[PDB]
Amino acid sequence: PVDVSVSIFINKIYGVNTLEQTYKVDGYIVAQWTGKPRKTPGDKPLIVENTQIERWINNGLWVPALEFINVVGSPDTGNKRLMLFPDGRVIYNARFLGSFSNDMDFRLFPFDRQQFVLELEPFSYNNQQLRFSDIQVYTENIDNEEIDEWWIRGKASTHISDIRYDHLSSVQPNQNEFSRITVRIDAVRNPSYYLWSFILPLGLIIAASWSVFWLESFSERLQTSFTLMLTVVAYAFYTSNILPRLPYTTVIDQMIIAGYGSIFAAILLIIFAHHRQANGVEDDLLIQRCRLAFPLGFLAIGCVLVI
Amino acid sequence: PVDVSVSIFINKIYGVNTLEQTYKVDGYIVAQWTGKPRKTPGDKPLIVENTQIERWINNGLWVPALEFINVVGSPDTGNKRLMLFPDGRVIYNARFLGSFSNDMDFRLFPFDRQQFVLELEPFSYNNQQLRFSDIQVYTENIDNEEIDEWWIRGKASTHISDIRYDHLSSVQPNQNEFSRITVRIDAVRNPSYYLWSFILPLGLIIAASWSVFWLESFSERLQTSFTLMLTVVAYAFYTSNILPRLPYTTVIDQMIIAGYGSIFAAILLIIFAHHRQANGVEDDLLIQRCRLAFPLGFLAIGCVLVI
Amino acid sequence: PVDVSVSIFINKIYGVNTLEQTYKVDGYIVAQWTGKPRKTPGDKPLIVENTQIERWINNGLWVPALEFINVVGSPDTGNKRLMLFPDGRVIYNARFLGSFSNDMDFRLFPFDRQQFVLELEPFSYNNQQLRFSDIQVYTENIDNEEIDEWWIRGKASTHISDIRYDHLSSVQPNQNEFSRITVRIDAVRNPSYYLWSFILPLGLIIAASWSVFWLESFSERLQTSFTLMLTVVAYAFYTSNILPRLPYTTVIDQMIIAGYGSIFAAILLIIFAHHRQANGVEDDLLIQRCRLAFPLGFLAIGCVLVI
Amino acid sequence: PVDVSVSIFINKIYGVNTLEQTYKVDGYIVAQWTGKPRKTPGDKPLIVENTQIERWINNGLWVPALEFINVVGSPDTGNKRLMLFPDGRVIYNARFLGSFSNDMDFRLFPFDRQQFVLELEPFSYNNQQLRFSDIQVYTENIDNEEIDEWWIRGKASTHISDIRYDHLSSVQPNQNEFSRITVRIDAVRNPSYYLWSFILPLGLIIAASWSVFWLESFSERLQTSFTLMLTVVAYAFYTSNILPRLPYTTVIDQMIIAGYGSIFAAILLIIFAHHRQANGVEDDLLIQRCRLAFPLGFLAIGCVLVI
Amino acid sequence: PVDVSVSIFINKIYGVNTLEQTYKVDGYIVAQWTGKPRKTPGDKPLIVENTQIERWINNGLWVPALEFINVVGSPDTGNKRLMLFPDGRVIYNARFLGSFSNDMDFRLFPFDRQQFVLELEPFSYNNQQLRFSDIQVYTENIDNEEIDEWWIRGKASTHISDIRYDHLSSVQPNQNEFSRITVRIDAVRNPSYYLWSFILPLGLIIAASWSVFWLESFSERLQTSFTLMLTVVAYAFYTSNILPRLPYTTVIDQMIIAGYGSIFAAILLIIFAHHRQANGVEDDLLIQRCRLAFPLGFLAIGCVLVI
Amino acid sequence: MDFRLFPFDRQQFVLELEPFSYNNQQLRFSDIQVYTENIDNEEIDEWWIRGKASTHISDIRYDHLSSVQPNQNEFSRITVRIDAVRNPSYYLWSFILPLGLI
Ligand SMILES: CN(C)CCCN1c2ccccc2Sc2ccc(Cl)cc21
Ligand SMILES: CN(C)CCCN1c2ccccc2Sc2ccc(Cl)cc21
Ligand SMILES: CN(C)CCCN1c2ccccc2Sc2ccc(Cl)cc21
Ligand SMILES: CN(C)CCCN1c2ccccc2Sc2ccc(Cl)cc21
Ligand SMILES: CN(C)CCCN1c2ccccc2Sc2ccc(Cl)cc21
Ligand SMILES: CN(C)CCCN1c2ccccc2Sc2ccc(Cl)cc21
User: Fold this and answer.
1) Residues D131 and D273 occupy one common structural domain
2) Which residue, A267, B13, B270, F70, shows the most beta carbons closer than 10 Å to its own?
3) At what angle do helices E219-242 and E251-275 cross, to 10 degrees?
């Protein structure tokens, strides 16, 4: 029941696809397993590069297909080599680049925590078993990820479990448990760019929105309101175009509704101030001095969005 | 007249293409059919992985090409294995990723009901017949589909019918019936994001549009109208850019016309109020108090949009 | 001089590319031609699927390369079969998906008439001749094409002509005429979406533009003009982004200039009204009552845009 | 030292890529060269289609790899045939589609002159020499290209020169000159669409910008300026999105700065008028009558942009 | 321990991908290494083109797989030839096009300095050693890079170092040092386009923003502020859409915050001016004459952004 | 230096640095800082530099008496090379031309 050692060198993780819940991983994979001894030229181990490998299989060299369970579509394989040893053992080494899938919650958008994962498992073998898994990452955190998009937190999580597959296990009674290496790296999004260039401007806009109450007239207030309205619609548009498209509301996306809100509540106040009067036309004395009472009310409701 | 058992494990449905009426499906397919017994090494069944399979065909192993009738372009095949059994039976197992086509009505829009479908049928065989179909989906609904885009309603819809193809059935008299497995999954779009972030803002915009009648002057009313106009055009653009492009009007798209409408109706009243007079310049007394009569008229016309 | 029968099943025409003058067509092609009789296993005709076909060619089976004259780049071929008959005749059957080219005039944009076309012709044969062509389309019109983008008018246009190719016909004296099947389907664009959601809003905008003459002041008129100016630029942008990019002016694109026009003519009038006077400042009495004379002049010029 | 005749049929030139300086060309290529006579079936020349060609090379048929020096990435080869003649001569014929590169100056912009080019040269042969080159285009100019994007001026430029490659010419002393066919067709951009739909609207906007001086007040003038400012920013955005992205300023791009300029110059004037006075607040009498002096100054500076 | 000479002809570097930190490089690679002498037809060296090469390996011709360490996905190989010499030496010559990865700091932005890099290294050989590396670039700078996006500063830079790979070096004791050629070209971004068309317009906008202090009223000042606000949001959108997307703030991106800043500070002053008074309503005399004190304060803070 | 195209030269000025007695002491990275400008003042100056920065840092074999120390005789050599063009003004304006007239 073959023991297989596996090593995964991860070279680059890039191009998240928020909508498809998808990321790209470039790296090498290495499998090692000891077979029946053989005679090699010299006694040096033998090297078999690319095209030559498939020919060695036509002569009964077994090389197991190891599938990336969580890759979306067959990956781009660059180079592959076999290392056939005189004492039997065999090393398969190949570089890969593949788009891998995992569940990704982006609802806390500019402040994400994500988990990029590789799942390896033999394509047709249940008593060929993954001996031990080793993942070699060569980076550093917190560091260059001001230039880079993501903050890795954890280093190395491995598993190597057994998968059941209870469906048509009568196709082969008593044996349908496959050996699955699971590799998972934890990462955090770099919330600098999105605050310094999206969160902050929106707040200033929402703040300056409240300055509508320091307009003297009423016509001034209500008319100006509509310009604020436009300002948000403009800023929502700017937001939507550049930010990653999703099927839920992000934190930024919530703040954008808060804008739409404060402004439309202003209009109501601005108008109800006018027509809650003692005569026909007296703006209600205290009410349009919600000048430093809208900011408080907004900030109070902006402390329950957090919890 | 060969019996073929089929099983389809569905791994992920993603990337709808509203314009092309198209979706992507990643999963495995398994075919089982009993052939002339053979000697396998040992008596254990024989495994034939990838490249090796095509070689077994060159020696007279028959393996039927099973076509995805409704796939748009030949799909990406990842790994394939044969399981040759000593008692004859044979298992073809392969992972696929393909862009599939089906009719899709998106007119409702953010409140969709769609039907993702697979159609399998042998490419050149009419008395080789699909024994039974089993589809294995491993998800859950109503559930994680706040993080996910779609709400599946049904689980398992199957078909296994006979297709006629009456065109040049004299090419082979009396026999042109192909066995077609049809698999169809029902799903609902998640109408959260689009309400919370598109429907609602537009309503507020349309609502605040009506507040034009609470402007005192006429110049104030008529001038402000044009800013409301701009506000809709802005919001139509924002809408159009982010939402899926289609060749018909969505619900949102109608609401956008309702905006364009109310605002232009306002303009007419606002102006007709001014010149429907007893003197040269008297704004008509009751009319510019359609303040809480436009909201009713719009809302009345917005309850016949539903039925 | 070989006779070849051809039939073309058209499964889907999708993804027009206005700039490249290009459309996508998914379907099957079948060629039939009678060769030297042969012995098949049993007496049942022999089936040769995919990879196996190329092997049968290495043994001297002639299978002509049929080229799609007007396909842009070699198409995606999915499955192919040979049907070798004991009495000689041979059937080639294969599914294709390809991006095809044809001349396409889009100057009447939302109200198009187009002609989607396939041109088939053998790649190296002049006395192998296309016997008869049959095209099998299974749709219906006027019908589901509210859900679908296009309205097919004609059904079946076929040709099968002979192409001259007079360049280096001394490479082979007296014989350079190739047999070219021409298939062409006529279709009309569904002008609903573009009217109900683009043409109409623009008209309301242009209409409301004229309401500028019902402003009392001159400062009111001239200033408001600049907001109208903004509105068109906004609406031009919205138009351009969503509509298909082209190298000529569409109908919509002209109407957008008509907007740009009426508004800039207003400014001139609005200003010329102010200074075409008897005293220093008298707005010319009749002129700023081109209130219901710009609409007529615009509508008069909008009845010569048609013829 | 083999003589090779070449003919290039150009079927379609489409999809310019302004940033990459890149275009697509679909067409056929034909190479002819006389070899050692051979026995053909019959005495009719022998036809060898596609896959079969590579098999004939395995038996010592020499077929020179002809490289497209200026193609970006190996091109899409559609169909290929050999024509083996009994008298020796051999004809290679294949259809190609490839993305070709050339230096492209887009600074003029909507009034471009460009030169689309093919450069052919053998990949490993210096005394195999391109006998004569022939290019077959079947179009017409001026004519259609109101429907088409480009105006071809010249017809046929050919070269067939010798390339030096002085780098490691000691790898093979005395012989490193390769025979290079050069084909180049000259074309002009169709400056209708961009004038009628971009150039023109911008001028009207810039013109209407100047009408700011016919506002009576000063507050009217200065405030309106900012709407003009917004108006340009709006139109700059519209321009940028639709027009081809570049790393230099186009003519349109300059015109857009001219807008930004006149409007900001207006602001300066409008304000300097107010505070260049004999009292505290007297708008300078002649200066705010730069009404028909800004138009002249702009048009004067717009006649030195040309030379 | 094989000596390998390498030459790299670089034809074109294009299509930077700011987000993925990625660039495209098309060129040829040449490897030369002297093997056991052989008999060639004639005594002329033998040429082996494309497909024929792979056949020569099946007969024991060793051709080392040389990997591009920093290429993202296996590159597009166009044509390849072997030049087998009678005296043993062998030349591998092939054209490639590949997307290569390198670290790229885009924070400066329109005034970038970048370093485009190739890393070549044998895929399975440590005592096969890269003798010497030669890179052939044929351009000129400062020069056409007004038409071209980038200004190359340096010419060459080579390395040829030894890489350790200390992970599972017990797989082969005492020998795991691979020979890596490193090529790096230095380049500068051409900051003309981004200054002349982005930096400048923004400044004029920000400058004209300050002209808000020369408005007479207070209602005029505060209301106009909101139009300036809109103007920046507009310009941010325009900026964001066209400029390369990044995960950090560019220089332009900072300037956009400076706009958002000055305008919101204006609002505060404009409002604080009104209610820092001796009576109920006296605008503070000196303060609203920060007319030529905001420009200075902004320019003072804009000289600490540099250092 | 090839001077056969004299008044119209292209030359390559080069530095080669390498440790005098060390093979596993290795030149980590090389950086060369030139502070000039071209085409420019080189009407006053004799030469026109074209390229800026060429570096190498290779390993030199020295296969002669490598048994003096078996298995280790590869020295780390920085190579720096600058490309330059001769200023063909003076020699044309004052030599080429007069001779043609003659
Ligand atoms: C600043 N350094 C974190 C840069 C590394 C960025 N990189 C990455 C990118 C996007 C999402 C997640 C990751 S994690 C990761 C794990 C291994 C390796 Cl080799 C690279 C990465
Ligand atoms: C929403 N949760 C049910 C998650 C499922 C998302 N996913 C999906 C996406 C778009 C449209 C339809 C579906 S159904 C489906 C069926 C099987 C699998 Cl494996 C994935 C999916
Ligand atoms: C609207 N119903 C006619 C549905 C068909 C639409 N479809 C189509 C799409 C884009 C452009 C032209 C066409 S025509 C056509 C011809 C044959 C077939 Cl099989 C499909 C199509
Ligand atoms: C009607 N005529 C304008 C046709 C020319 C259009 N087409 C083209 C497109 C973009 C850039 C350059 C060209 S030139 C050209 C040369 C040969 C052929 Cl076959 C087509 C073209
Ligand atoms: C003015 N000419 C130097 C243009 C250089 C543009 N091009 C380039 C593009 C993007 C990043 C780096 C470079 S460098 C380079 C090196 C060789 C060649 Cl062939 C082209 C380039
Ligand atoms: C116009 N500038 C090129 C003047 C430089 C002349 N100078 C020089 C002289 C003879 C041959 C080559 C050079 S290059 C060079 C590189 C660096 C420095 Cl610091 C001086 C020089």
Assistant:
1) no
2) B270
3) 170
